[PDB]
């Protein structure tokens, strides 16, 4: 199943188009600052990304309708080191038909969804999910 394409701005104002990431595995995470699990999971994600960025895994962490200030505050408080984009009007959340937050779509280098994850993720689970979608062994 093809992952719905979208264009959003990242927290530095850079245009990110999902299809631009083909050839990489994509860890597509929907979240808000009201997700107490994200306070746990974002540091885990950041920590795993130190390894998986150079294995061809990209994170796209889609913030669901919050202001740039509230998103920046959260990224700083929780040591985010990965791309975060602003779904300001929730249209991307709606296209993915996402209800429970956080929700993660694991997308392969071919641009297909291989797994949808809801509920809590341990750092071990995050490691294995990234391993699932990485394009090589680099």
UniProtKB/Swiss-Prot annotation:
Keyword presence, Membrane: yes
Record's function text: Thiol-disulfide oxidoreductase which is required in disulfide reduction during c-type cytochrome synthesis. May accept reducing equivalents from CcdA, leading to breakage of disulfide bonds in apocytochrome c; following this reduction heme can be covalently attached. Does not play a role in sporulation.
Subcellular location per the Swiss-Prot or TrEMBL entry: Cell membrane
Gene Ontology biological process terms from the UniProt entry: cytochrome complex assembly
GO molecular function, one term: disulfide oxidoreductase activity
Coiled coil: none
Pathway: Protein modification; cytochrome c assembly
Organism listed in the record: Bacillus subtilis (strain 168)
GO cellular component, one term: plasma membrane
Disulfide bond annotation, renumbered to this chain: 35-38
Key words, A-Z: Cell membrane, Cytochrome c-type biogenesis, Disulfide bond, Membrane, Oxidoreductase, Redox-active center, Signal-anchor, Transmembrane, Transmembrane helix
UniProt domain Thioredoxin: residue ranges: 1-135
Residues of the full protein shown: 40 to 177 of 179
Membrane topology of this protein: Single-pass type II membrane protein
Name this polypeptide is given: Thiol-disulfide oxidoreductase ResA
Recorded family membership: Belongs to the thioredoxin family. ResA subfamily.
Gene: resA
């Amino acid at each position: 199943s093809d992952a719905p394409n979208f264009v959003l701005e990242d927290t530095n104002g850079k245009r990110i188009e999902l299809s631009d990431l083909k050839g990489k595995g994509v860890f597509l995470n929907f979240w808000g600052t009201w997700c107490e699990p994200a306070k746990k999971e974002f540091p885990y994600m950041a920590n795993q990304y130190k390894h998986f960025k150079s294995q061809g895994v990209e994170i796209v962490a889609v913030n669901v309708g919050e202001s740039k200030i509230a998103v920046h505050n959260f990224m700083k408080s929780y040591g985010v080191n990965f791309p975060v984009v602003l779904d300001t009007d929730r249209q991307v959340l709606d296209a993915y038909d996402v209800s429970p937050l956080p929700t993660t779509f694991l997308i392969n280098p071919e641009g297909k969804v291989v797994k949808v994850v809801t509920g809590t993720m341990t750092e071990s689970m995050i490691h294995d999910y990234m391993n699932l979608i990485k394009p090589g062994e680099t």
